[PDB]
Coordinates of C-alpha atoms and ligand atoms in Angstrom, one line a residue:
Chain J
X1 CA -3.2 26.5 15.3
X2 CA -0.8 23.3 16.5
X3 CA 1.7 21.6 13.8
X4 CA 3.4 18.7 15.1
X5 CA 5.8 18.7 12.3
X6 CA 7.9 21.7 13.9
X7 CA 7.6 19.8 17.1
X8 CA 11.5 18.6 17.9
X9 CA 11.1 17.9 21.6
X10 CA 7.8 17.4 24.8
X11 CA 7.5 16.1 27.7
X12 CA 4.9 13.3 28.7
X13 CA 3.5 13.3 32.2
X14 CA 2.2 11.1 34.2
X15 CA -1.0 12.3 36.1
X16 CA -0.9 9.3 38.1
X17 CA 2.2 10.7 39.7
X18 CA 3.2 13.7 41.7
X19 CA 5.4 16.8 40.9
X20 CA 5.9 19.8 42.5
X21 CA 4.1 22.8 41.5
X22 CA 7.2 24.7 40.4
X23 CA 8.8 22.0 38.3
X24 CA 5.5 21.7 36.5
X25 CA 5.4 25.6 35.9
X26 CA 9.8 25.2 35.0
X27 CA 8.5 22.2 32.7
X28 CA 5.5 24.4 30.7
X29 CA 8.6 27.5 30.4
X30 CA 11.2 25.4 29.7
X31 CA 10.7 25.5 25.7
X32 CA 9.2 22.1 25.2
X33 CA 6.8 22.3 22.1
X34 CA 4.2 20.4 24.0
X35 CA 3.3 19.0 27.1
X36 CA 1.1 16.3 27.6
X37 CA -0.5 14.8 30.1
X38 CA -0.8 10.4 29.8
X39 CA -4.4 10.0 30.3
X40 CA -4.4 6.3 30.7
X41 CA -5.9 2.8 32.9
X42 CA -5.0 3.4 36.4
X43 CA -5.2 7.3 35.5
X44 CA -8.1 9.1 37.3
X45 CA -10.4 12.3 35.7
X46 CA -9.5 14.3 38.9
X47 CA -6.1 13.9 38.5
X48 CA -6.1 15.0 34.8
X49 CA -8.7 17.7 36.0
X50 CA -5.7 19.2 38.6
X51 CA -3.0 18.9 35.7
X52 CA -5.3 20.9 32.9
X53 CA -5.7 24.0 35.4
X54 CA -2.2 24.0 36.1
X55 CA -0.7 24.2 32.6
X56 CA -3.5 25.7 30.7
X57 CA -2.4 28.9 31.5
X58 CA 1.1 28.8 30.0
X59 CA 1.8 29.3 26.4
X60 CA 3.3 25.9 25.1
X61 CA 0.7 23.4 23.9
X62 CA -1.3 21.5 26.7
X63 CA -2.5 17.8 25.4
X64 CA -3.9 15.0 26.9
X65 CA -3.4 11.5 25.7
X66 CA -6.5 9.4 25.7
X67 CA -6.0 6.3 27.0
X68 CA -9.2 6.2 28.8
X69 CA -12.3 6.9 28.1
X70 CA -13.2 7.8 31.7
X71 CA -10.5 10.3 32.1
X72 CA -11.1 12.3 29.6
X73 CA -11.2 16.2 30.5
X74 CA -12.2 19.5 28.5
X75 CA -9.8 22.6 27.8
X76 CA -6.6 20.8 26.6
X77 CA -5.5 22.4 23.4
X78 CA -5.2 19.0 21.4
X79 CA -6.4 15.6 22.5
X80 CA -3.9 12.8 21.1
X81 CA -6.3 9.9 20.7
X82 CA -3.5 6.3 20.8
X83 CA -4.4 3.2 18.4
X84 CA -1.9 0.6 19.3
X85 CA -1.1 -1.0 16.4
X86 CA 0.5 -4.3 17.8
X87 CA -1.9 -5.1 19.9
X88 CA -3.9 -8.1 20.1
X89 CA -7.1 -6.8 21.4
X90 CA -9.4 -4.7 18.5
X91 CA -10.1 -2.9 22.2
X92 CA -7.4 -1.0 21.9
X93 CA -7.1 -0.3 17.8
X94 CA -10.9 0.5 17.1
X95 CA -12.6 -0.8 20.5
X96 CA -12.6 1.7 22.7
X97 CA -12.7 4.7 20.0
X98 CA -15.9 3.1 18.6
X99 CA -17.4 3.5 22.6
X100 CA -16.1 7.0 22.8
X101 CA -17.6 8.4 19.8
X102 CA -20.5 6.6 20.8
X103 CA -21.0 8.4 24.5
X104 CA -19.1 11.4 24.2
X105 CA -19.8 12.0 20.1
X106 CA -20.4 16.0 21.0
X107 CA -17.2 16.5 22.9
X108 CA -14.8 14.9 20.4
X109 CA -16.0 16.7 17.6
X110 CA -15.6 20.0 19.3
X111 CA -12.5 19.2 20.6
X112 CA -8.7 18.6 17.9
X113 CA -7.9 15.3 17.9
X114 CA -4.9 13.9 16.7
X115 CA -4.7 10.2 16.1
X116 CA -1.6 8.2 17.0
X117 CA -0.3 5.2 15.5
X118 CA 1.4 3.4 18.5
X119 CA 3.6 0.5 18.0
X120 CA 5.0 -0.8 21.9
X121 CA 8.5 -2.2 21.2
X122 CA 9.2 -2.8 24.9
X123 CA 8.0 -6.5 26.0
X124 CA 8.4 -5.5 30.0
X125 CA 6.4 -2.3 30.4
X126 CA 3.0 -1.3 32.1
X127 CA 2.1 -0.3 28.7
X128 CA 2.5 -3.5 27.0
X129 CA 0.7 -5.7 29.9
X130 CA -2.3 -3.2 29.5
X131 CA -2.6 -3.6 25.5
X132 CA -2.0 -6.9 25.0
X133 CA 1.0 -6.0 22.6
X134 CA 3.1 -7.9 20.7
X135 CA 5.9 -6.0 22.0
X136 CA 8.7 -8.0 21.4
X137 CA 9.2 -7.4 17.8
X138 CA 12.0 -7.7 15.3
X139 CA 13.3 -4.4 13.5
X140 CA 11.3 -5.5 9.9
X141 CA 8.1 -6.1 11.9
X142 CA 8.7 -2.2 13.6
X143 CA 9.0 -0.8 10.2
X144 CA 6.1 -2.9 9.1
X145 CA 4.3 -1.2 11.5
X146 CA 5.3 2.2 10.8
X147 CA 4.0 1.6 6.5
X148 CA 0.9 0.8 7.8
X149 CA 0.2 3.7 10.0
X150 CA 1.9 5.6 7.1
X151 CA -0.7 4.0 5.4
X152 CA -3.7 5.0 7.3
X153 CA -2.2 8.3 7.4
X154 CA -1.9 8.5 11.1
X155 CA -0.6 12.0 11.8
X156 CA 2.0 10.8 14.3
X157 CA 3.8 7.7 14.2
X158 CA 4.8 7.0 18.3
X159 CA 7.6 3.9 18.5
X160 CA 7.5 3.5 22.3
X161 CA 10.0 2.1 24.5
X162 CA 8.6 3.3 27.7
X163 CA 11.5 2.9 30.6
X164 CA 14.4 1.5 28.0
X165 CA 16.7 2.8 25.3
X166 CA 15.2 1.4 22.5
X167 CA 17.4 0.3 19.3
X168 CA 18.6 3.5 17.3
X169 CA 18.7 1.4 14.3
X170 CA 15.2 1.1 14.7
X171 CA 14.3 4.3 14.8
X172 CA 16.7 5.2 12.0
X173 CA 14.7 2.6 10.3
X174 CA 11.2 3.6 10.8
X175 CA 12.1 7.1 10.1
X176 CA 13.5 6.4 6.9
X177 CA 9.7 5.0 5.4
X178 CA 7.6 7.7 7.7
X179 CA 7.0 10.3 4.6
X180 CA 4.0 11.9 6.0
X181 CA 4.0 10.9 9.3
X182 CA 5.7 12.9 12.1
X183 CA 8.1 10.1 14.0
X184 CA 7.3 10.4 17.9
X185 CA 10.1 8.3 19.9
X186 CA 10.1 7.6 23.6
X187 CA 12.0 5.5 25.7
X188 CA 14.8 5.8 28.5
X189 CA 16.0 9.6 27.0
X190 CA 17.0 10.7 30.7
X191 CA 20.0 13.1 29.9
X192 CA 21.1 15.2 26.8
X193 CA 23.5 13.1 25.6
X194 CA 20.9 9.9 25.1
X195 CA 18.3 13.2 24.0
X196 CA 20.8 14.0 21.2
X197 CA 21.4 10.7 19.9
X198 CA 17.7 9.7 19.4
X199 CA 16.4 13.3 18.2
X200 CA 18.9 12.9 15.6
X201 CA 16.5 10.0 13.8
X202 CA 13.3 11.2 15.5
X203 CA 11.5 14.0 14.7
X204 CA 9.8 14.5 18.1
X205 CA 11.6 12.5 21.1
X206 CA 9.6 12.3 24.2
X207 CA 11.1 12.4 27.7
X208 CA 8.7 11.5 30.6
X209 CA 10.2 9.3 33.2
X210 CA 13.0 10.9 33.8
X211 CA 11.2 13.8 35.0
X212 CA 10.4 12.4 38.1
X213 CA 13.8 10.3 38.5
X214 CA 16.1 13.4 38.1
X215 CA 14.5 16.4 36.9
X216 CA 17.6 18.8 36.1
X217 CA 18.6 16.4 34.2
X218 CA 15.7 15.6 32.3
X219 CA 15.0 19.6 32.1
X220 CA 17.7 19.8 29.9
X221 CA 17.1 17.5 27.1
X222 CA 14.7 20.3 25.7
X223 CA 18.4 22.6 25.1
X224 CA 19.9 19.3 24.0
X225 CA 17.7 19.1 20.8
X226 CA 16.6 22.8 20.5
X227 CA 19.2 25.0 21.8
X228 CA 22.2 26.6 20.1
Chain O
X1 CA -4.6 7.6 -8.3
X2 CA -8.5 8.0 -9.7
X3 CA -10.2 10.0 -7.7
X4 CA -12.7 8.2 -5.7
X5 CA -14.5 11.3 -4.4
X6 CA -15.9 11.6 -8.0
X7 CA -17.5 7.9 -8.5
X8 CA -21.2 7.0 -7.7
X9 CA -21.6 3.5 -9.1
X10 CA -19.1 0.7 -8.8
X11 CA -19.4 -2.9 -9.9
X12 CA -17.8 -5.6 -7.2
X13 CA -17.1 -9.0 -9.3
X14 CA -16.2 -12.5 -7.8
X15 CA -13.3 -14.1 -9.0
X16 CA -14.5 -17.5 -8.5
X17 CA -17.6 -16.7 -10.6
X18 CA -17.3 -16.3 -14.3
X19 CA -19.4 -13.8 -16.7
X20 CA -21.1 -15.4 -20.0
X21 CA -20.7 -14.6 -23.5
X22 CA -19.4 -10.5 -23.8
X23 CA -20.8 -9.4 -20.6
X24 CA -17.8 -8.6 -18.9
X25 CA -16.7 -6.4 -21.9
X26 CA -20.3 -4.5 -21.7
X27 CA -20.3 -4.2 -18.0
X28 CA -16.6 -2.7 -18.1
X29 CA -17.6 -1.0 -20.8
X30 CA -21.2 0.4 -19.3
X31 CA -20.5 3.8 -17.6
X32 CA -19.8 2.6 -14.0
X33 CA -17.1 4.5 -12.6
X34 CA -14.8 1.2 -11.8
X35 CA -15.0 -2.7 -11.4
X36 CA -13.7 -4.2 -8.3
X37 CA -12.3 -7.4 -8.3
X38 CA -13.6 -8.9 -4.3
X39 CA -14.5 -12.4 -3.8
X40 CA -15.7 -14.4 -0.4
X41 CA -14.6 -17.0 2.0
X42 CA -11.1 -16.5 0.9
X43 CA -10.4 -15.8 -2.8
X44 CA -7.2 -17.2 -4.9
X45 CA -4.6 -15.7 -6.7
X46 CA -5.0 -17.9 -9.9
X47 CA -8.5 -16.4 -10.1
X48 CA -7.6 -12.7 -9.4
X49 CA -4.9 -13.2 -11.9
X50 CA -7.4 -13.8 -14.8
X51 CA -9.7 -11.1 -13.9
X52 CA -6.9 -8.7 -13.3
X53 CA -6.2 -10.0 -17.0
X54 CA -9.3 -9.3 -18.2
X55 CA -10.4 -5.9 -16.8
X56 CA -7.2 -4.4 -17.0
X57 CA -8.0 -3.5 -20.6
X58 CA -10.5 -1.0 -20.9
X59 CA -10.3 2.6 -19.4
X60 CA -12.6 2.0 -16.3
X61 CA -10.6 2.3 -13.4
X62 CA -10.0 -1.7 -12.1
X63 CA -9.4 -2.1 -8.3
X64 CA -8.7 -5.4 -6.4
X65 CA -10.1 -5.2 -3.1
X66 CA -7.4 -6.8 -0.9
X67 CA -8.8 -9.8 1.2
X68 CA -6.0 -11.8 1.5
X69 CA -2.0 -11.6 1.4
X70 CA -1.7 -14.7 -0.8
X71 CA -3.9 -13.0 -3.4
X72 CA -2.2 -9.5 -4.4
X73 CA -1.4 -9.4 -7.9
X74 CA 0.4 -6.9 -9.3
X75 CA -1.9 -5.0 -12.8
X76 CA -4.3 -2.9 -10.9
X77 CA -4.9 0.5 -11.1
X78 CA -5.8 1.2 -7.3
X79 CA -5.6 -1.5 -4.4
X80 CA -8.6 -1.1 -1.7
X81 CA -6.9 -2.9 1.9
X82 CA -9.9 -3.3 4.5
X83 CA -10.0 -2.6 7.5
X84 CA -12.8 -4.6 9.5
X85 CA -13.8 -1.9 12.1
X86 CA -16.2 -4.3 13.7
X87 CA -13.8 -7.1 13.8
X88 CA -13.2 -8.8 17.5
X89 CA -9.8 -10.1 16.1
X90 CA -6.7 -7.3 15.4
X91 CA -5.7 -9.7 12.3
X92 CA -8.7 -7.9 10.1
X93 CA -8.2 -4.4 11.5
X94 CA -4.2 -3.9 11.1
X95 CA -3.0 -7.6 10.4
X96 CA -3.5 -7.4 6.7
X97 CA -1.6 -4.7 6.3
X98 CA 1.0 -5.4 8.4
X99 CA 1.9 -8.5 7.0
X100 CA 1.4 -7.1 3.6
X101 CA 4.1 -4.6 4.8
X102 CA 6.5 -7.0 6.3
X103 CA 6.2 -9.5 3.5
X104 CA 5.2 -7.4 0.3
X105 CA 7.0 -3.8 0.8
X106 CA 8.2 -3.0 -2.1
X107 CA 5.2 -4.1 -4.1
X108 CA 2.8 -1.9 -1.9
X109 CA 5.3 1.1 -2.6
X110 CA 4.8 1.0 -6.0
X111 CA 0.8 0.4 -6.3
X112 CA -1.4 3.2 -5.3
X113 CA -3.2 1.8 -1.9
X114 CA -6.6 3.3 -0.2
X115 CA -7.6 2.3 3.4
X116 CA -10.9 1.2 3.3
X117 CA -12.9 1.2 6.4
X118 CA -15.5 -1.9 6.3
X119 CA -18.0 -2.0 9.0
X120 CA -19.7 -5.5 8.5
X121 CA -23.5 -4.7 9.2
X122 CA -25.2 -8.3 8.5
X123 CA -24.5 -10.8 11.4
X124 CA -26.0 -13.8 9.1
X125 CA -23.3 -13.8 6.0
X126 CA -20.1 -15.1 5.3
X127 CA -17.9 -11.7 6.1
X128 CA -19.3 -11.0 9.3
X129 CA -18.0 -15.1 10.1
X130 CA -14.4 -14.7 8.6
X131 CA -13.6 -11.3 9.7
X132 CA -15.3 -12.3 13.1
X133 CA -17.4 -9.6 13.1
X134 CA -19.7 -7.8 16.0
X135 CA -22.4 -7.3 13.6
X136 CA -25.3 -7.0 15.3
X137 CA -25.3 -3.5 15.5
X138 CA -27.5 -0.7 16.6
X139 CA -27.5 2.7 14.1
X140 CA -25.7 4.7 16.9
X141 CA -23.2 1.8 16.7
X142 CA -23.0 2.0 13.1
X143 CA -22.8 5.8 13.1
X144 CA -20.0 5.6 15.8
X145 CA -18.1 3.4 13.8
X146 CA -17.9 5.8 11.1
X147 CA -16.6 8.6 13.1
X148 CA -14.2 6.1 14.0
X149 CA -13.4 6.0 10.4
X150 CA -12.3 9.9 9.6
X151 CA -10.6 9.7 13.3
X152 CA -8.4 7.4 11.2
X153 CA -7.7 9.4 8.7
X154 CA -9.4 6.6 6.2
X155 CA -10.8 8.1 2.9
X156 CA -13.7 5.5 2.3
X157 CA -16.1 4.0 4.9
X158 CA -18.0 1.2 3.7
X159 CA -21.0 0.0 4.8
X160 CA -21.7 -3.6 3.8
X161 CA -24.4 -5.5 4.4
X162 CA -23.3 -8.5 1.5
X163 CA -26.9 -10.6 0.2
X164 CA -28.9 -8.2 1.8
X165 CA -30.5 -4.2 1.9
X166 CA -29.3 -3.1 4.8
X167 CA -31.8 -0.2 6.8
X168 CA -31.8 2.9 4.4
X169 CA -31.6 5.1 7.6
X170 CA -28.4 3.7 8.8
X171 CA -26.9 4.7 5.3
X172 CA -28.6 8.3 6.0
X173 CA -27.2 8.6 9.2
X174 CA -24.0 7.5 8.7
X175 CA -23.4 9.9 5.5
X176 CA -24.4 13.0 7.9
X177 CA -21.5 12.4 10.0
X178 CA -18.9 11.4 7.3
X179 CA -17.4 15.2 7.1
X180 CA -14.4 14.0 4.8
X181 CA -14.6 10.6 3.3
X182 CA -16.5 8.9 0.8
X183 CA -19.5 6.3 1.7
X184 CA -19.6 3.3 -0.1
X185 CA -22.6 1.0 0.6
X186 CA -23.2 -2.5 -0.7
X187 CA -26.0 -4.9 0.1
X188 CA -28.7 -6.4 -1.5
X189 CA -28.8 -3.9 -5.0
X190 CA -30.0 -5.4 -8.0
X191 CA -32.4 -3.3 -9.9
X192 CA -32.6 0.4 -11.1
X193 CA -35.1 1.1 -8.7
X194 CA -33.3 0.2 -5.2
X195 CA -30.0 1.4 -6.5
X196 CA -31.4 4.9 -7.4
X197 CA -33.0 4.7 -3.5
X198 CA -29.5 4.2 -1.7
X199 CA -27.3 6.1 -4.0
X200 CA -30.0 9.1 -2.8
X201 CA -27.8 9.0 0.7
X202 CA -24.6 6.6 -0.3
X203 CA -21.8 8.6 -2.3
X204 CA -21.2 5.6 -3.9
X205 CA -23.3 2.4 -4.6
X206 CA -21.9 -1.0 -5.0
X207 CA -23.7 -3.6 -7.3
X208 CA -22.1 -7.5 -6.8
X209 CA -23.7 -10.6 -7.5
X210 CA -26.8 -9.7 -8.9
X211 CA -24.6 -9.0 -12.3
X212 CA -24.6 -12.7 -12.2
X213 CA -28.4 -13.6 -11.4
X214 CA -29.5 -10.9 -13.5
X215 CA -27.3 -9.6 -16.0
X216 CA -29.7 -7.0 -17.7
X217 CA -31.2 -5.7 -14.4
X218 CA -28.2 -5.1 -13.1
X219 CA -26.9 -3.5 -16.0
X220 CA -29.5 -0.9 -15.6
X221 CA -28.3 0.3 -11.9
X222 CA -25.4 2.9 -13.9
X223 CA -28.4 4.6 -15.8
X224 CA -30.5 4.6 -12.5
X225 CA -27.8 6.3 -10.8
X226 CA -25.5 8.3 -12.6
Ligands
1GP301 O1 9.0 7.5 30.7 P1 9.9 7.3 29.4 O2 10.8 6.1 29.5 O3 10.8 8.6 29.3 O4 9.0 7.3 28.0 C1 8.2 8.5 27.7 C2 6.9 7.9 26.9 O5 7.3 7.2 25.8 C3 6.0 7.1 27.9 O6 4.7 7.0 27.3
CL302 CL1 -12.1 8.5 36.8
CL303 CL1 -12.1 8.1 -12.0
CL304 CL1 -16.1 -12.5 -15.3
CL305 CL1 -12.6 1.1 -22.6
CL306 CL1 -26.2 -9.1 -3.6
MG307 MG1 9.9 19.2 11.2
MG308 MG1 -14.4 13.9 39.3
MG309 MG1 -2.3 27.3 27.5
MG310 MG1 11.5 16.2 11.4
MG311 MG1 -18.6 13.4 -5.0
MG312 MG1 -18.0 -11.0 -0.2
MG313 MG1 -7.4 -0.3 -17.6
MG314 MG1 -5.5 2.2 -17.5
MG315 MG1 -2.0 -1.9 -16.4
MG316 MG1 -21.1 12.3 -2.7

């Protein structure tokens, strides 16, 4: 019953950290169109475990990112399942699919998936050390990327900055050859103002971080993009 | 674009071999629902070029199966861009078509491309040494790779198994879990009798080399099959 073409704003947590109760119940209310939970490396199945029972009783969409095979959890409404695109290990294009489907082949097909085409454009991040990206890319090799997942038919395009303001130019870029693909954009949006200028190339911006560096802030990037 | 869901019997040429006589003209001309232009250990554009030249005439949908940059050329009716599943190096998974992207934009816009996934089954040929390929598979591996292949959104999985028949059972299998692409498998076909066998569980069986071994045998796979 999830479209993420109407999508125009979610948040991203990080199980791996800590937030209190009521900003994660503030966060599910706050009129997001998604949130989801970043099951990646370091990221344990207990943690994701605790986040799931918390938000699955709110209305707005509950997914986990799959970054790891171990963490992966049952009763999310869609599971968004990463292929980094500029990475240099298959691991983390086919790799690590091919050995999910292999040991948990029942629970992905009874689950919605929804594959990402992931291209890291930030060289520093956790993210980037993990994949073995190419991360520090010139704005033709980004929207190089973008044709191919366009290409594969990815549902969701994510251009990922992690903790900086990426290049708007970029993202006006990419947008401008994603036809089919829904443009997911995330990196350094920590206030409304940076939320407004990215959502207006993005279709879905992203805000994580911020959540846990200044939350009333971060709370209101969702008015920023979808309020009067 | 032609409508791949609707073929069962394709014909895979090597540029760098050459037909005798009119037998290009009766192969294209035979009932097989296209000819693709492939190749091995690299290919060149000189020799794509005069294929593309010479299949480009008759009705039966021609596709060049992409397997290097340097090679595009521009004529085709559908362009087939692997993507090496099994490959240990990123270059034959997404490379290809990155570069093509970066490089050859504007051409890709304007021919109609397919995503093929390719999961390289033989450990002892040529393709499984260029692309790098883990080919030593098991048929849970094989079957897992093509789950991987619908997660991706790809509309053809192709199982290839290049000089060789590859295990019938893996073809079974791996059609029961493709829920919404179309299985190609090549490997090994070069009579009506063992094309008739695979295409009972392939949606769509590929015939290469033997066209040159055996011209007439081979001929015979499109009656066996279609
Ligand atoms: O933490 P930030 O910088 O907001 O980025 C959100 C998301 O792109 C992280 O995967
Ligand atoms: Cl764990
Ligand atoms: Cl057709
Ligand atoms: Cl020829
Ligand atoms: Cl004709
Ligand atoms: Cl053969
Ligand atoms: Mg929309
Ligand atoms: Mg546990
Ligand atoms: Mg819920
Ligand atoms: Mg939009
Ligand atoms: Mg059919
Ligand atoms: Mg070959
Ligand atoms: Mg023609
Ligand atoms: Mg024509
Ligand atoms: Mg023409
Ligand atoms: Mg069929």
């Amino acid at each position: 019953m999830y479209d993420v073409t109407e999508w125009k704003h979610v948040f991203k947590l990080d199980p791996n950290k800590d937030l209190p109760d009521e900003q994660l119940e503030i966060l599910c209310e706050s009129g997001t169109d998604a949130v989801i939970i970043g099951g990646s490396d370091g990221v344990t199945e207990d943690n994701v475990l605790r986040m799931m029972s918390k938000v699955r009783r709110f209305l707005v969409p509950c997914v986990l990112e799959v970054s790891a095979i171990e963490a992966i959890v049952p009763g999310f409404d869609l599971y968004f399942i990463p292929s980094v695109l500029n990475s240099k290990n298959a691991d983390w294009i086919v790799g690590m699919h091919q050995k999910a489907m292999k040991e948990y082949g029942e629970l992905m097909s009874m689950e919605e998936i929804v594959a990402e085409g992931y291209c890291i454009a930030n060289p520093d991040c956790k993210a980037a050390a993990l994949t073995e990206a190419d991360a520090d890319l010139n704005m033709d090799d980004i929207v190089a990327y973008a044709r191919v997942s366009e290409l594969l038919q990815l549902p969701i395009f994510y251009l990922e900055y992690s903790g900086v303001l990426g290049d708007i130019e970029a993202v006006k870029k990419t947008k401008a050859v994603l036809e089919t693909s829904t443009l997911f954009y995330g990196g350094g949006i920590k206030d409304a103002e940076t939320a407004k200028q990215y959502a207006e190339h993005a279709d879905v911006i992203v805000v994580g971080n911020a959540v846990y560096e200044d939350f009333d802030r971060a709370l209101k990037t969702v008015a920023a993009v979808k309020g009067e």
